[PDB]
Amino acid sequence: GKSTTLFSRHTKAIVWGMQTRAVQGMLDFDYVCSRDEPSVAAMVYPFTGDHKQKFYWGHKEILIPVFKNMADAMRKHPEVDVLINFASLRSAYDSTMETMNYAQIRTIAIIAEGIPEALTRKLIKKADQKGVTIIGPATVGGIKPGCFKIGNTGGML
Amino acid sequence: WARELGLIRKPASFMTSICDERGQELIYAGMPITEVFKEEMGIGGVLGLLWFQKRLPKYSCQFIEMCLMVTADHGPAVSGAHNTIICARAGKDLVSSLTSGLLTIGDRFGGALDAAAKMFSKAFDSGIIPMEFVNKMKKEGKLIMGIGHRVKSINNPDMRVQILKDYVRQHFPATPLLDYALEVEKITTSKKPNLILNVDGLIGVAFVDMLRNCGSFTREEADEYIDIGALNGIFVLGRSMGFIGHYLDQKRLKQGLYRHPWDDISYVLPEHM
Amino acid sequence: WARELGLIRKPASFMTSICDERGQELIYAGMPITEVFKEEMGIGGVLGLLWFQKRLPKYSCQFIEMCLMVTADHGPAVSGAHNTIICARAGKDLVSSLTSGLLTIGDRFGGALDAAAKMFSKAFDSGIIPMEFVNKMKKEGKLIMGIGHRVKSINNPDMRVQILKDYVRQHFPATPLLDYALEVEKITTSKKPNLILNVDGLIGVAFVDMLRNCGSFTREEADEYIDIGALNGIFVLGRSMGFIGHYLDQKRLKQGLYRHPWDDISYVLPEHM
Amino acid sequence: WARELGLIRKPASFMTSICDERGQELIYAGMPITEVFKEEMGIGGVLGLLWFQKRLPKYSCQFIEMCLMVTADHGPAVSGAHNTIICARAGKDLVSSLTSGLLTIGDRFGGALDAAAKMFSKAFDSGIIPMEFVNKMKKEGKLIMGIGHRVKSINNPDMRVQILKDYVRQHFPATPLLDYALEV
Amino acid sequence: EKITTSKKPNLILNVDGLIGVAFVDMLRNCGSFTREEADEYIDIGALNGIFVLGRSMGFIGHYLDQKRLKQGLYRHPWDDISYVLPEHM
Ligand SMILES: CC(C)(COP(=O)(O)OP(=O)(O)OC[C@H]1O[C@@H](n2cnc3c(N)ncnc32)[C@H](O)[C@@H]1OP(=O)(O)O)[C@@H](O)C(=O)NCCC(=O)NCCS
Ligand SMILES: CC(C)(COP(=O)(O)OP(=O)(O)OC[C@H]1O[C@@H](n2cnc3c(N)ncnc32)[C@H](O)[C@@H]1OP(=O)(O)O)[C@@H](O)C(=O)NCCC(=O)NCCS
Fold first, then answer.
1. Closest ligand 1 atom number to CA of residue B107
2. Which residues in chain B are closer than 8 Å to A61, comparing Cβ atoms?
């Protein structure tokens, strides 16, 4: 299940958490890398209803929807394969337990810092049982220049 | 200079998908104003444009004009026209008198337009009989919105309900929710003659029919425009003509300040607080 | 019971010469609602009945519908549409959003509908040549209301003042005040090209001309309604469609609460009070 | 004449149990205006008289005045003050400016008063542990009205909730809701 | 007031006039206003503000009281109206 090409030039992600600065940094990276399509499909923040956040692609503006429940985010958007999880250290474990059992997700990225060791042990166990690739705790993420950037890897533009 | 030079990039709020004003022509929803006047769409047509952003058919634009002609003034007794007359007699101006009349269009006066659509379409998609919908609504102790009227009855009917019915029977294809509402009306007038299907219920169910049985609204648009409140706007924009008429009339009769005599009050104060 | 059997004689306030709601038919000005719909008078016809209490001719009713179509939404930048958008983004409701936008239509926003009619009709009834009028409104400060634009100048018309001007010159019999206003605009276009006759001035002078040149107004009701504010009523009832459109649209794009960032404020507080 | 010689009858609407304006003195709730000014109650005292129809104690009166002092202006960035500035700049007048700024005080602006009263009273009279209440609200997926403030923290206080907290701790007898609110 | 109370005995200095002249007297007799601000604030409308802010307590009192008495919708009966419509428009 642990594939080789994690991120490519045709990847699209689902962000978990109201992280408009990080998503706009990712969209600026994907504009700078001469990439045709943005690498974010939708965002998840469960504390308000669905809407469309407005983000900046190059010189122009586009819209990225924000959902409340993860089930609608997986149903409406099946082309994604990577879920970035900006949840806190106390709400990332349940978020990953909910998010691993979905179909289209091929890799998750737990950017939180301060997870319990028993919780990340159960998380690693379910991750190797399912076959997803986990880039988890206490990270800033990864960056594949020319293709993809996870969160705020590297810093500003 | 940096924006016109094009090297700054600022995030604009206020998305507003209606009425692009800049440029060589005042574009409405998507249609320029010369095309609006050339296609002869009336104030119902520009209501369809500005509110729904869908160019409506001609039997629906005329129905919107019929709604704004029927939901005009209904006398000065009712509470909104009463507040407009009180403020115009205290000599203010048009926007404050019309506005202090418009801040009574709530739930008991004139804001049944949306609840008599939400209720009648929530009891039609979970399909019950009218005789059980009335039983449920009395059992819960809540008022069937858009079924009651203070002064009109079946022995004293309001004619503006009949003018809309004789239009929505002919030019409207496939209007079942109106038939459902008429069934509930006669079920309730069999018991009490006071409870007559209002214009504030007939316009609600006829607008749900006009949205979901004519074109250009699928099922999420035509329920979003009920949940958002696009049917209260029909009453507010229709009754603005009556409230401005009452301001102009009380300004032309040169009436004085209103005082509301103490023989109509009965102060019921505590003893010694 | 004593008034029903008739021996009390209490004096009644609220004189209201409009819209007899009682009885069996909803009677408008003097004409029932069935005659209103049978004689095919639109919302301009019921505006002539409710506001002016006259049976307006069929060109004038269509002209009032034309005015309420051009004085609809004119972009969300303006003060009233901005207030409606801020109240809709604070999640309020339709009547408080539209109402708190409608409390800007005073003098600086929406006041050119009435100021440019009182000006052009005070300086036409005083017998003043257009060059003397332009020079009289020069020595006293006082920029001429209803004249001016920002882009659309000449050989580049307003294209919604042209529709109204075409309708008035084709349909109105004996229109002297529009011709006086066009002489004033021909004099003042020589100064700057973008001093074209505004739409807020053209609706004012065409409305005053319609009142004092069509039938059933003498000349002393025909400027009583100008003094009272029928033109302010025309602008408020026209722009209510645009403000309700802005409420529904900001409710439909699901916008959040507005904050107006401190980069655009510049507090100029005193030192220590 | 027919009611002055007392023979007719009239049902009178508008019951109004506040401020009898007739008679030889402007009576408030039950207390005349000379007693209002002799008993030296501030505007909190007449807020208690007109709104609540009780003569509130003199610590609750100063607390009502303290609430009307801290819920005064909080900058013109916020939406109601912004609408008041737009209507004043369109040159209207005081009552249309203040009124079209007042018609934003709904649920997202200024509704946190009634919302945080009713939420913390529905989570206390149906008694839950505070740790279970915050988990219940997180599980349902809505925020708690009361708590917030992006600038201040436990490091540096707000200094306008601090003065209110000082007043209720130094004047209020038997305050369980505040204690419960602090717990959360 | 002394001059005009001799014509009719009821013409006394009203509360709505004593608050006005005592407020103007405060602004132009106490410190911190010069004399060009203390007649600017009267022209701007800072005396309407005293009435509106004072009367807001009474109007909120009437709202809370009419909500607490469970009073229903008002209709204002036709025997208090006297419609004076035209004959047939
Ligand atoms: C507007 C309204 C107050 C007029 O009703 P009304 O003539 O005053 O009737 P009353 O409130 O005086 O009488 C109450 C009785 O009639 C019942 N009733 C009155 N209106 C009712 C209604 N729409 N639906 C169900 N029951 C109603 C009450 O349940 C009560 O029943 P009871 O005999 O067992 O006690 C009321 O019908 C209503 O709120 N309708 C919904 C809002 C609306 O449509 N407004 C438009 C017309 S103003
Ligand atoms: C001097 C200069 C700036 C003035 O330009 P302008 O277009 O006339 O600008 P203004 O604001 O003065 O025009 C206002 C005129 O329109 C009138 N006007 C404006 N608004 C009006 C309104 N609503 N109603 C009626 N009249 C109005 C004004 O009263 C005034 O007319 P007036 O001359 O009778 O007083 C212009 O001539 C210029 O650009 N000079 C520089 C050229 C040069 O030498 N360049 C260097 C060589 S390379």
1. 42
2. 11-12
